Design a protein that fits this description.
This protein has 16 residues and is mostly helical. The chain has one helix and no strands. Helix content is 25%, strand content 0%.
Length: 16
């Protein structure tokens, strides 16, 4: 799981 996919990388969290 990548719970921190947007929490830390909002630039690549378009599909959060």
């Amino acid at each position: 799981v990548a719970r921190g996919w947007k929490r830390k990388c909002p630039l690549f969290g378009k599909g959060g």
